[PDB]
Design a protein around this nucleic acid. Structure first.
Ligand SMILES: [Zn+2]
Ligand SMILES: [Zn+2]
Ligand SMILES: [Zn+2]
Ligand SMILES: [Zn+2]
Lengths: 198, 198, 198, 198
DNA sequence: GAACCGGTTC
DNA sequence: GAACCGGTTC
DNA sequence: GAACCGGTTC
DNA sequence: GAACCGGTTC
């Protein structure tokens, strides 16, 4: 509970998370690599994800997004927004999301922003909502409010964003995860990591 | 309910929406592309649509027109009229439609203009009326009160206009949708998008 | 007093207005062509001018900037900021100067933005200051708050910016003028008009 | 008094500012190019300057350093430390000098950091001291507390550091100036700009 | 110090 | 989108 | 900065 | 309807 675990766990109610097709254009505001499981996004731009289920009934259950550093040494640094932005003008005046928080949800007002008093981890939870009438989809709109590259926060040390499905008491029914990179050029970053790997 | 769903849904009372033939002339005030499902219209000019039914009886039921941005990032921006028009002279003095609204209905005085107090979405609903004695047709006259290209509103980010058929309690019995583009030259825009695609 | 005169007028003090050399790079934030006597600048960016005089004072003199339309038919529309600029966030909240004004002054706190209660012309007046010791001219930082290209205000009808040096009682002691253009690309625009006269 | 003059001004005492030879090694903590009159230094490292005068006093004279932006459009933003520097641990706790200030003085306890309550310009003043016996110049140790490269404060718009020698009542007796650049690599940066003029 | 990256401008 | 810049890696 | 689009004039 | 213009995209 004190240290987040970072392993894929479908659990008994299969938990699956996918992405509608993202542009293969260099100008896309966000894009996901199925080869690497890496999300490339831009600051403050909605990158939506779809969580999908086939056996959706538990009660009052929610989904958490919790950012974590992959590399061992900072893993004990609470991930947060690096000092100029948490405190800049451009995205501080608008929401009730804590200025200190890295991850926001944009289309949901039943969002609960958690800053753990004991562990200090900050994450964002939404109540589970079945899809809108008739199909796999259920969209959550995330907003990333800083770069991976930023001074004071991640400082160019890549982070995995872990999404967990949880019962009201916190017990995990499903969880999946992938690493996220928040640069000013996700289409170019997508192509490059992939180039070096092949 | 907070985020509009944008998928075609005929529903149990088949819901179908069509267009009488529009000019293939470059001077047409409006025109629809069956290939792309894209409506090209001009500011403030009546572009009528026909909704048709074969099994028309529910009670007090209505049809909604609700504009939505297609692209993910603004989808959380309430679609509205960009600051010079909501506030210009030319179409503000005339109707009780809210100056802030993008979509109006012209031949109907039982129009109810909804500005959601909770979600903030603005849409226009009319009570369902059977056709005038004897044929498929039932016309609704829409007026688009700003360009897609306009500064402050859509700002050149294309929007889909979703028409839903709803019972008095709001439950959807039919819905269909298509993307709309509101330029100063719909005949030319029709020909061009279509050129690039083929 | 009701319709402004639009002619250059050297004073007893030989009022002259000049501009420092501006980068001729297209990336310049503003550039004047001495040839056509017209200023090209960018929205909201500081655009300083040079006044030079042969003698000083007399006590209490001021300098006014008042924009006026060159075409005969618009001259009776008071020239003001367009409704989209007038009502936005970017520069209305941070300023104490009235929002309807096209012309602002930067770094000067005794600026008086005159909105004639009677004629309605808007201008900005500062008290005359002799130059800083040993310099030839006192710089004034203007800010132009709408583009020539703008909808609702100036609307693509070119403007002359009239600069008058006047005693407290209003009599004109010096006068000069130039036509002003406020686009989003001043190096290119300057270059294109210059290409066009020949 | 409201907008600073940005011109070199020898006083009655022939105020001159020079710099000792700096290692030309790229490992130098700071290096000035006499050719371009611009200083290259490193964050938080002592960067001393030489003043020379032809005559002393008169009683009670002081020396001010005030940074000001070279580009016209930023000149009205008060130049200060960027929020990341302003609020950190490395140099805020150990110093009694105000954190918002770009310029600090080392080893001098009667330094007065002036934050104009009225104009808001920040500068640092020390009383003039004649040189130590038999030396030509009195050294002042400045510390620059944000990089030119910094986010939120200076943000990659070059700065002139204005050094003025002034009587207690504020009148300027001498003046000199240079453009300042505070990067993480001064020998290389100096060398690159110098390569570039020719 | 030379080589690298990743945000910024043209 | 390409070329440039400037702190960081090693 | 060059190339693109989409509203405006001739 | 064709040619021009001028902020925006990339
Ligand atoms: Zn940041
Ligand atoms: Zn509009
Ligand atoms: Zn305007
Ligand atoms: Zn800083």
């Amino acid at each position: 509970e004190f240290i987040p675990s970072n392993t894929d766990y479908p659990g008994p109610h299969h938990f699956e998370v996918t992405f509608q097709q993202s542009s293969t254009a260099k100008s896309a505001t966000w894009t996901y690599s199925p080869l690497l499981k890496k999300l490339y996004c831009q600051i403050a731009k909605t990158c939506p994800i779809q969580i999908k289920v086939s056996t959706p009934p538990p009660p009052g259950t929610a989904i958490r997004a919790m950012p974590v550093y992959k590399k061992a040494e900072h893993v004990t640094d609470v991930v947060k927004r690096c000092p100029n932005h948490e405190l800049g003008r451009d995205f501080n005046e608008g929401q009730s999301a804590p200025a200190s928080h890295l991850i926001r949800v944009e289309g949901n007002n039943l969002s609960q922003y958690v800053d753990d008093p004991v562990t200090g981890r900050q994450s964002v939870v939404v109540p589970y909502e079945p899809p809108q009438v008739g199909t796999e989809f259920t969209t959550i709109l995330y907003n990333f409010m800083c770069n991976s590259s930023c001074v004071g926060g991640m400082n160019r040390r890549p982070i995995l964003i872990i999404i967990t499905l949880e019962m009201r008491d916190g017990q995990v029914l499903g969880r999946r995860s992938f690493e996220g990179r928040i640069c000013a050029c996700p289409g170019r970053d997508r192509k490059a990591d992939e180039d070096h790997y092949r």
